[PDB]
Design a protein around this ligand. Structure first.
Ligand SMILES: [Ca+2]
Ligand SMILES: [Ca+2]
Ligand SMILES: [Mg+2]
Ligand SMILES: [Mg+2]
Ligand SMILES: [Mg+2]
Lengths: 565, 570
């Protein structure tokens, strides 16, 4: 039978999406700080890797109190990364190479150094109600003691309420004292979010990653007898009143009203896309919430449509070095079971807030984990360095940028996952001409670097390239999936599609060898051909699997190419 | 192609297992108490239902403090239920009808009225260490102020330690004060469990349901500097020191040593089966525990073999009327994902310790839930009443006899704890006490809805829960259900499918709208389903009758509506 024809998917439905951490990608100007001209000089890497889309962690004007998540001007670039001109050059050169470029910002809050906040604190007309401003809770017992409006706890610990001496009122900060929560019931705030997005789309951005969406909306005092209602207490003895966990965020997180804002953002993008043509512009949402609240980002049963997808953090929250093959299967099945019909699945192993993939799992698992990301249906999300198996870097107390004491600092710091990218075995691993990098270069850069992996016959990077290339096959863009564990140690993932080749992942996620009966794997006729193997596998690409009995070493993964069903 | 032959499975791998609660099944003698002559009189019901095996809740000599789970003599029958002769007649008649009979074995504890306990408390030679006896915790603050050995909390509320004046020591009770925990590090106790099991297997029992196994073994004071270690505090402020939930049972539940006892029981039973021949005798284990601790009952990575299966309580613990179709799928997949290869799956929708299936779910979901039970691979477990969709009976504070409610509850809270509503007499018919008894004075009150919900009515009427139950047990004879693959996914938040398929054999498809709203689905999305297909079973409220042809790929299901479709072989 001739292979069936498939309808082309819109780019966002099956893109390889790469998270750039711009501070650590490429320093062009010898200051030891990654920058936009650096990213521009290495756009060819994305084409070479088979990446379709890049997003950058925030690069907007920022006092850098929360390392760029505290945005003071939503319409300009942070000077350390370059200029608006550099950003426009990045869009031009990326688009010339066929890449999509997404911007990351946080709708929930602005820097207290934003003009929005300066003007709002000063009660300037049109800005007075831009943020959540509240009087103290009346204290007729001790009128000399000022009470905050409610017991709400910041994500950073302490009160979510900060006193303004100038305004003689409290403002809400769900995050840092310097990150002020916008009032999303203010039409002027909703308009300003449309204005920010329109500005960047007009420059040519292909879409946005929007952070902290669960925190957008808090209880309306109108619904609680004119006061901000206390969050219910967790009743968990390990948390005091100043500690995150003391409260259940009933009135401060996952309010149904936040989804109406998201659906409004999707309506705005759909209208923008209709009125401009070219490549669909998208929003990918970030929110840590239960499965029900996560899936409401896609849309609802009443037919509302939201984010092109909410990010899937299940591999970060629910898989670990302790996970066995049955855990891998059951967690993979959660998104695929709960996602609404027609939703696009996405998969994430890493970001700048977590241990790097081989450090969080094991060094021998890098290839199998990259295969899972690339072979599951939908969108593969790669964190900078995963394509070469970068490990966490050693960072000393004295070299720490993410500052609590010299003995315990390593339990808190996210710096080890943010060390400069290993291009090669040149000075500072080719990240910089300078030895004075903003974080130290990991000690293993001479063993683990991109240039070496391109030179050597087998490598993480070559496996990454073979997998992004495989995603062009109809079986991966349009094929069904079947996933089950064969043992506590080994699971299979089968992509199949009538008249098209079958692709099978077999992955021993354990620390011991395992033998499995390939007769148990659906749609796998033998002999089959090894398409990809883990760098430590005895089997090379092109190796024939002929026996139904297969021994997999600890961490060993194979992708088999088998005849069509 | 001619249908392929399948190798017949051992009876226990795909049986329909029915839990009898003897006290509430059939009263033969007008005392308002179910009895063995009552069960004997309705053994034909199990044949009529398509039940392969019955397990009875305990029928051994008992003060009835925990309605039989407090056993004073493990070798004889509770007088209210009848005699050893009645039991022997029950086995004979059940076996003549081709039924298997399992007994409820309660190894964790004995009644404080057992000879074991009386002799142990008296320190008679060979019985001194039969139970967990402990000195008071030394009190260096105020010497001789009597402290319990540890903070351990009973499942029925209060301290797990009871002072004996006679012995001047505390004894352990994980359950009621009257249920005394055996010492499973004592070889004589382990020997006694083999003695009990051999006695009843020799009578001809087809096996045992094993009670409360997570609680068998607690921390050895030899590993904790000669004391019983405190369980970690939960740190949940809603629980004071006398309330269940105040502690995390780290030292009192799921100890790795308990599984070695289970594997020893299986070894004994395998040897018994080998030496005696006839039908395989089985053990099914009861334990509420996390997935890892539950799966260790089957066996371990080192090749130990335990229970033929541990009961799957997921439809009790993890699904309810709050659940959507995606929850149903994701929970059904948990057992099938985590069960060891070669394991037999089982499905439990109710028991005497939990609210009835239609009460936890909804009245309009009864058929869909029985279909899930019967159509999923492996063993279907039915609790007394599920085959006719019995609802929880009303039981006042005044009528409540459950020790757990009497101990943890008061006239306002008792409903949070009481198991009595799931223990109300079985609805045979519309006669006095729904035909459970000739007496109006029943040990628990008969549910108010017996005129509407009773077996006789469901056997007469054209469409009923019971007729649906019979059609589903019959369907389990098909190779597709005994040997077929499964595929399960949600079509929406409201509707899911379960497909049983087997090349050259008919394809069977459940479609179930678990929601309170109508749902329209595309049957083109269902694997191995070619139309037209035939309705084999429908919910009693479905517009479709058995024999209806499904021809359109757009299917609207009403709230709670379930269909089984019969479709051509793949
Ligand atoms: Ca907010
Ligand atoms: Ca015990
Ligand atoms: Mg630079
Ligand atoms: Mg009686
Ligand atoms: Mg299939």
């Amino acid at each position: 039978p001739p292979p069936t024809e498939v309808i082309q998917l819109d780019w966002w439905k099956n893109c390889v999406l790469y998270q750039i951490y711009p501070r650590s990608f490429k320093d062009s100007d010898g200051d030891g700080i990654g920058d936009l001209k650096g990213i521009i000089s290495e756009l060819k890497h994305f084409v070479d890797a088979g990446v379709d889309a890049i997003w950058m962690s925030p690069i907007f004007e920022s006092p850098m109190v929360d390392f760029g998540y505290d945005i003071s001007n939503f319409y300009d670039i942070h000077y350390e990364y370059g200029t608006m001109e550099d950003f426009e050059e990045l869009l031009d050169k990326a688009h010339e190479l066929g890449l999509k470029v997404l911007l990351d910002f946080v709708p929930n809050h602005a820097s207290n150094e934003s003009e929005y906040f300066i003007k709002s604190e000063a009660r300037e007309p049109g800005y007075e109600n831009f943020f959540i401003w509240a009087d103290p809770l009346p204290n007729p017992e001790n009128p000399g003691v000022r009470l905050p409006p409610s017991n709400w706890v910041s994500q950073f610990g302490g009160s979510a309420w900060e006193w303004s001496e100038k305004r003689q009122q409290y403002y809400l900060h769900q995050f840092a004292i310097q990150q002020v929560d916008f009032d999303f019931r203010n039409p002027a705030v909703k308009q300003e979010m449309f204005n920010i997005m329109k500005f960047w789309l007009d420059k040519g951005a292909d879409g946005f990653r929007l952070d902290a969406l669960p925190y957008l909306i808090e209880a309306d005092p109108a619904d609680h007898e004119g006061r901000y209602p206390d969050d219910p207490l967790s009743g968990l003895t390990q948390f005091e009143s100043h500690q995150l966990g003391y409260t259940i965020p009933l009135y401060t997180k996952d309010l149904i009203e936040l989804y109406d804002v998201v659906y409004e953002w999707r309506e705005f993008l759909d209208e923008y896309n209709k009125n401009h043509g070219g490549d669909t512009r998208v929003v990918f949402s970030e929110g840590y919430a239960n499965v029900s609240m996560t899936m409401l980002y896609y849309g609802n049963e009443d037919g509302a449509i939201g984010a092109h997808f909410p990010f899937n953090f299940d591999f970060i929250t629910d898989l670990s070095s302790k996970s066995n093959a049955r855990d891998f299967v059951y967690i993979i099945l959660r998104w695929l079971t709960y996602m609404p019909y027609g939703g696009i699945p996405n998969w994430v192993f890493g970001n700048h807030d977590n241990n790097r993939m081989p450090t969080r799992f094991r060094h021998d698992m890098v290839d199998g984990l990259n295969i899972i990301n690339m072979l599951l249906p939908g969108v593969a999300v790669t964190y900078q360095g995963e394509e070469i198996g970068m490990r966490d870097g050693y960072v000393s107390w004295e070299d720490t940028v993410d500052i609590g004491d010299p003995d315990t600092y390593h339990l808190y710091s996210r710096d080890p996952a943010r060390t400069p990218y290993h291009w090669d075995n040149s000075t500072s691993a080719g990240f910089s001409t300078s030895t004075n990098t903003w974080l130290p270069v990991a000690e293993d850069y001479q063993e683990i670097n991109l240039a070496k992996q391109k030179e050597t016959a087998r490598s993480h990077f070559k496996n990454y390239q073979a997998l992004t290339k495989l995603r062009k096959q109809a079986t991966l863009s349009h094929g069904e999936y079947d996933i089950r564990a064969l043992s506590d140690r080994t699971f299979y993932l089968v992509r199949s599609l009538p008249t098209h080749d079958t692709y099978v992942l077999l992955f021993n996620v354990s620390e011991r060898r395992d033998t499995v009966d390939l007769g148990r794997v659906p749609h796998l006729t033998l002999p089959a051909t090894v398409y990809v193997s883990s760098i430590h596998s005895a089997r090379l690409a092109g190796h024939e699997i002929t026996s139904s009995q297969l021994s997999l070493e600890a961490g060993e993964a194979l992708v088999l190419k088998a005849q069509p069903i």
